[PDB]
Amino acid sequence: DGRSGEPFPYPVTVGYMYIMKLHHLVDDKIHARSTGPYSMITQQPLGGKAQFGGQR
């Protein structure tokens, strides 16, 4: 155990696995808005992160 230094009590399965970085990434996901652009039609906020929209 890296934190306590104590050995873990039982043998754990370890090895090498092939892992991929998928194209879903927080940087493209995290979005937040206080106020912003509104649709001229329905006068509701826009939607999508690209348009700085609000959540439905």
């Binding site: 890296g2 934190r3 306590s4 230094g5 104590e6």
Partner: protein, 234 residues
């Protein structure tokens, strides 16, 4: 290399024998570097006095019941292991306990030899009827931490000598937690909480100070390899 923000130590006293300490803020990750070492140091590194073996007149081969005593053998052992004692002798010292007639036998009835102190005299030990008497010998020593019974077995051990588990450690229980404190933009800083409960021999304060002393020496062994070596100073 750099100089961090100086962490502070604080104490909230829960009871006379119990206290909480907080060290904060710590550079992220240092809470766990201090935590388990401080807990195990508090537990195993502080010297204290404890009962090691006992002799009970009237019990030899089978240890079950003592005639004229309500408590059985192993319950007397339990009541004795809870006895709080300090010793200056650094060598094993035998104390004696004898009481007759009806009444209650407490730790206050022990006659301490010079250089030992029973801190919990009112502790109930046994209870006797009119026909029974309790004559029991105790061998008290100094040590660190908690040694089991089998390690107290003498190779030349006397007949009727009962070895017991010894609690030398003046601190009874220690737990630790690492929370997150916020320093400017960093919310992941480390805060160390130590919940420590001791006997009435020591206060939590002096226990923490002792563990800190012996730790400073211990890692001083590494510091002394090179005194020119540069490290975090804050």
């Amino acid at each position: 290399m750099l100089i961090s923000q100086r962490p502070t130590l604080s104490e909230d006293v829960l009871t006379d024998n119990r206290s909480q300490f907080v060290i904060e803020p710590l550079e992220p990750g240092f809470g766990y570097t201090l935590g388990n070492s401080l807990r195990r140091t508090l537990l195993s590194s502080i010297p204290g006095a404890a009962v090691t073996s006992i002799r009970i007149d009237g019990v030899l081969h089978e240890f079950t019941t003592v005639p004229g005593v309500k408590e059985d053998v192993t319950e007397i052992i339990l009541n004795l292991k809870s006895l709080v004692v300090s010793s200056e002798e650094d060598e094993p010292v035998t104390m004696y306990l004898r009481k007759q007639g009806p009444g209650e036998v407490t730790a206050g009835d022990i006659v301490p030899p010079a250089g030992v102190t029973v801190h919990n005299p009112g502790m109930h030990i046994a209870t006797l009827n009119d026909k029974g008497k309790l004559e029991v010998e105790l061998v008290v020593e100094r040590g660190r931490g908690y040694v089991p019974a089998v390690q107290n077995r003498a190779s030349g051990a006397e007949i009727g000598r009962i070895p017991v588990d010894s609690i030398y450690s003046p601190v009874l229980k220690v737990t630790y937690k690492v929370d997150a404190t916020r320093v400017e933009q960093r919310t992941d800083f480390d805060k160390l909480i130590l919940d420590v409960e001791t006997k009435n021999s020591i206060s939590p304060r002096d226990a923490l100070a002792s563990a800190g002393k012996t730790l400073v020496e211990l890692f001083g062994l590494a510091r002394e390899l090179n005194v020119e070596a540069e490290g975090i100073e804050i």
